[PDB]
Design a protein around this nucleic acid. Structure first.
Lengths: 159, 51, 185, 222, 171, 58
RNA sequence: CCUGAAAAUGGAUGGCGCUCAAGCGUGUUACCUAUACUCUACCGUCAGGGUUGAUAUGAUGCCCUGACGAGUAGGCAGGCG
RNA sequence: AUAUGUAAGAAGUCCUUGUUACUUAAUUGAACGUGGACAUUUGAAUGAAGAGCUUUUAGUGGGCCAUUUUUGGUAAGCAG
RNA sequence: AUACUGCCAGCUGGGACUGAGGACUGCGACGUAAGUCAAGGAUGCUGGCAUAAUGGUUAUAUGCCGCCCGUCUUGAAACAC
């Protein structure tokens, strides 16, 4: 018959790594998670307790509960036509802080800092990010860079 | 009640664009320009005519 | 052809023109459409749409609810406005001298108000005294406390009052409702 | 309230003042337009003179026209055509060129023809087929007051003020461009020039990026 | 459309470590500028680690025939894909321009080898006006001193459906 | 007679008719599921702040 | 292009017929026509608004503006008998 | 490659605690707060056709066909 | 000083379809001062005919198109009922 256990189809997902087996380096147990922190979920296959389900590998959530060894994570999961709020009790080895979250907080401070400098003089700092713009006009000098003319090559075997 | 298209019906054109009078009168659709002989370098024609 | 982004020919979804055939309600509507269009007062707009509301959407307001409303600071002398029935509350022993404008008053509610020395006016009288809704305080009754709504959303682990006729032991208090009989909800 | 001359005199005087500044602004736009095109020409001459090559700036505005019907479109380009306001065939909109919008254009490439419109075709598009989105309604421009009443907070007071904000992509392009209803073009007057539309322009078809040849296609469609 | 000889000079985008890149140039026959810039990136993608996104085109120009009213012998070297494989050929054709010989070349390639434009690379279009550089007998026959031939069996086109005398094919 | 066994055909389209809206977010999430020791202490801390605030704005 | 290349009623590049084609590869145009696109009129639907004005015009009356219109099973509405 | 999670802020950000019975060696923190500083840029783009929400009920619960990926099968207008 | 490209709020012609809509308003244009105008939708002039002439209906002919409805069904004109 068919087989759908808890860890079915997890052969490579929960595989440890190449030359990264054994004990976990302790910085993962030194990281601190507060309620509201944005965390990623990458299950560590060596630690079998507090393991996320395979659905939650690669999912990013928000901490809502902090216990002795684990954090409660809220994750939005798509069930049918709507997202359901799921609550994961995950041990710290299976989570890490989202790096994009930390980068945006630096932008928040950088935006506030830039506003403070501009407010001293009113130079329209324009904190808002912009998409890559079409190139402006430029002049290409040819001195020392004479154009080298190219043609399609003939066909040949090379075997 | 009825949309009137400029570039025809010159009256609706002048209502939208008062400059249509000046653009027409000065013939800015056909305006000459002064000439000066700025010659491209000889390398430029050699590259273009290069075989 | 057009790649439609939304459903075509979609009705508004709100009421206009109350479902009631009551001519005096329709008379109040025609007065308050006029006020809601020519006055720019937000009060007239909410009174106009409140007059369209169905009976369950116009829950009764007891004089207790009005007395508490008049105990808001700065609100003692405001005209209490309710679009619907004002009912009488026997759980209070004191009523202030307020003015209450309402569609309907119960006999006790009207008697309670006039005995305290206040007025029991209709909404056409309120319009003459407050065309812009000056110094008014709109009272809405409790809408989510009626019997029908406690059966809405009934399902496992919702706590929402099963639809049942006879109440007591051996009327749905067994398998599915306790762990000693199978499971609990 | 006698009201024969006093009130109408003030309104006509106010209208006359608005015309004078529209006239002054339209003269300035013509000077700016002509200056930019000559200055590009002069720069190309100077680079050629100094043995160098003048690379023109990448075009900042594209006009995209949907050349495919509404049947059998996969969901992702169908969503992009909706966000670009191209919900009918031959419907056209202006798009400010950025990496965010360029990647949108590459997704809907099999369904549209687009390129870089010149001032002439934008002027003709707005004059001939120009409708503003006012109270969720498509009202013809047909008057300077209609734009000033809806885009005057951004300083756009005339039809040419609106055209100027489109041709030279301005700070208020998004508000000016979204104010314009999606342009409703005809089929091209002389045809599409190809036997089959639904190949890329490079392949002898019709869809994709035709850089400047959009002007011929659009003018014959407009 | 009418093939036009375009010169296309492009380069890889200028980074910080490598300003002023090496500025490659090609002469490609194309219908118009859009196909010209497209054909450029196609070939430059074949000879260098560069694509359209990572590079820019610095000059697009039309090369005109030096004298469009002198007939010349054009030596054309071409590689093309048939159904089975790839082959390099050297063809040659009389013309007055480089472009119209290339237009001729694509017509002949389509006719004789069923090679669509997609399948053909023009390796090198070379002009020669000196004989004994001409290798193909289908071109040598027009170079004989004092060439003169009739045009036998002259068929005259008729504007009307009916005519009132049997045609004459004299010349 | 054999029938069709399973297909997710048309299921994504059905789920997008009035579909995939995110769950509505609130200020003050429910304190169910959080540690009772924190919950019990939070109750006392919130009580004191209301008493402390009431004294200040007497 | 030809050989390889054999199936049963008579027979189908759709048919006629076509041979510097009306065949095949390719290029360039011109031209034809969908219930599609543009514009205009009229019907309906929906939406957004105006209107307490004179010794004529019930305010679910009168009027302005824009968009839209395929439909089985099915739902609702307004009507006909 | 394609597909996919999250984020791009007014429920956000910058003070010796203001509260606690939690926590800390400890006013240490944690959570939640009072007062202070931030509307045309409210912290990418494009769009938004009004958001959000509730109740109730019909029909349906035999499917089939392109392209692409793909399993069994020599294959099938076959089965999945 | 030119078969190319682009632009002109450049000019001069030849055809077609449409004429929606107020008892009184807007935006504009044109002369230096009775005001006119192609400027928020057709008017002017001139004929013929007040009748089956136009038109409605119906029959036929002609051009092109049109399988038998109901049902079950993935699929019906079915050599399915």
């Amino acid at each position: 018959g068919k087989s759908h256990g808890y860890r079915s189809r997890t052969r490579y997902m929960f595989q440890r790594d190449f030359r990264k087996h054994g004990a976990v380096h302790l910085s993962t147990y030194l990281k601190v998670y507060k309620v509201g922190d944005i965390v990623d979920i990458k299950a560590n296959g060596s630690i079998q307790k507090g393991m996320p389900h395979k659905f939650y590998q690669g999912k990013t959530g928000v901490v809502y509960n902090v216990t002795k060894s684990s954090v409660g994570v809220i994750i939005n999961k798509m069930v049918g036509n709507r997202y359901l709020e799921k609550r994961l009790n995950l041990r710290v080895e299976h989570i890490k802080h989202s790096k994009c979250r930390q980068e945006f907080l630096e932008r928040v401070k950088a935006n506030a800092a830039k506003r403070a400098e501009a407010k001293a003089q009113g130079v329209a700092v324009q904190l808002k990010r912009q998409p890559a713009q079409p190139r402006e006009s430029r002049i290409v000098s040819t001195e020392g860079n004479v154009p080298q003319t190219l043609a399609p090559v003939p066909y040949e075997t090379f075997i | 009640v009825l949309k009137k298209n400029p570039l025809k019906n010159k009256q609706v054109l002048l209502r939208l664009n008062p400059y249509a009078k000046v653009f027409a009168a000065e013939k800015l659709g056909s305006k000459k320009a002064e000439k000066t002989g700025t010659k491209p370098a000889a390398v430029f024609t050699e590259t273009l005519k290069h075989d | 052809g057009i790649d439609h982004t939304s459903k075509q020919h979609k009705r508004s979804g709100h009421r206009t023109a109350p479902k009631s055939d009551n001519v005096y309600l329709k008379l109040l509507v025609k007065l308050y459409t006029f006020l809601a269009r020519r006055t720019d007062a937000p009060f007239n707009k909410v009174v106009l749409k409140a007059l369209f509301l169905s009976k369950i959407n116009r829950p009764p307001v007891s004089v207790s609810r009005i007395a508490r409303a008049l105990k808001q600071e700065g609100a003692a002398n405001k005209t209490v406005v309710v679009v619907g029935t004002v009912t009488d509350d026997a759980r209070i022993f004191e009523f202030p001298k307020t003015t209450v404008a309402a569609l309907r008053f119960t006999a006790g509610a009207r008697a309670k108000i006039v005995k305290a020395g206040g007025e029991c006016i209709t909404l056409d009288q309120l319009a003459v005294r407050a065309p812009k809704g000056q110094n008014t305080l709109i009272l809405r009754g409790p809408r989510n406390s009626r019997e029908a709504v406690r059966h809405f959303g009934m399902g496992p682990h919702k706590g929402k009052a099963p639809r049942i006729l006879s109440t007591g032991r051996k009327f749905e208090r067994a398998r599915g409702r306790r762990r000693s009989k199978g499971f609990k909800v | 309230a006698e009201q024969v001359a006093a009130e109408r005199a003030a309104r006509k005087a106010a209208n006359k003042e608005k015309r004078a500044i529209i006239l002054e602004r339209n003269a300035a736009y013509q000077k700016e337009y002509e200056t930019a095109e000559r200055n590009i020409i002069q720069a190309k001459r100077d680079a050629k003179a100094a043995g160098s090559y003048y690379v023109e700036a990448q075009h900042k505005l594209v006009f995209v026209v949907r050349i495919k019907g509404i049947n059998k479109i996969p969901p992702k380009p169908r969503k992009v055509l909706q966000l670009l306001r191209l919900t009918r065939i031959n419907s056209g909109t202006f798009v400010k060129v950025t990496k965010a919008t360029l990647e949108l254009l590459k997704l809907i490439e099999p369904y549209v023809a687009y390129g870089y419109p010149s001032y002439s075709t934008i002027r003709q598009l707005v004059y001939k087929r120009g409708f503003g989105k006012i109270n969720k309604q498509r009202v013809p421009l047909s008057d300077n007051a209609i734009i000033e009443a809806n885009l005057g907070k951004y300083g756009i007071l005339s039809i040419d003020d609106l055209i100027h904000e489109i041709i030279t992509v301005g700070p208020h392009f998004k508000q000016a461009n979204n104010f314009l209803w999606p342009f409703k073009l005809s089929n091209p007057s002389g045809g599409w020039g190809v036997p089959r539309k639904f190949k890329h322009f490079i392949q002898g078809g019709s869809f994709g990026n035709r850089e400047e040849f959009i002007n011929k296609l659009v003018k014959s469609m407009n | 459309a009418h093939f036009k000889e375009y010169q296309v000079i492009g380069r890889r985008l200028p980074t910080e470590s490598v300003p002023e890149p090496k500025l490659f140039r090609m002469r490609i026959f194309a219908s118009n500028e859009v196909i010209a810039k497209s054909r450029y990136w196609y070939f430059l993608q074949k000879l260098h680690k560069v694509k359209k996104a990572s590079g820019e085109i610095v000059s697009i120009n039309q090369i005109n025939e030096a004298h469009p009213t002198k007939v010349k012998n054009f030596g054309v070297w071409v590689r093309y894909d048939s159904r089975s494989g790839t082959h390099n050929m050297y063809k040659e054709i009389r013309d007055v321009s480089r472009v119209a010989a290339v237009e001729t070349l694509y017509q002949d390639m389509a006719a004789r080898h069923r090679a669509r434009f997609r399948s053909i690379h023009i390796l090198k279009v070379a002009e020669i006006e000196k004989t004994a550089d001409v290798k193909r007998q289908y071109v040598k026959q027009f170079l004989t001193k004092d060439l003169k031939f009739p045009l036998p069996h002259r068929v005259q086109k008729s504007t009307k459906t009916f005519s009132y005398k049997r045609p004459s094919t004299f010349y | 007679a054999k029938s069709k066994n399973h297909t997710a055909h048309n299921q994504t389209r059905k789920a997008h008719r009035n579909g995939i809206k995110k769950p509505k977010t609130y200020k003050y999430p429910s304190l169910k599921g959080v540690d009772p020791k924190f919950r019990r202490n939070h109750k006392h801390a919130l009580h004191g702040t209301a008493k402390a605030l009431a004294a200040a704005k007497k």
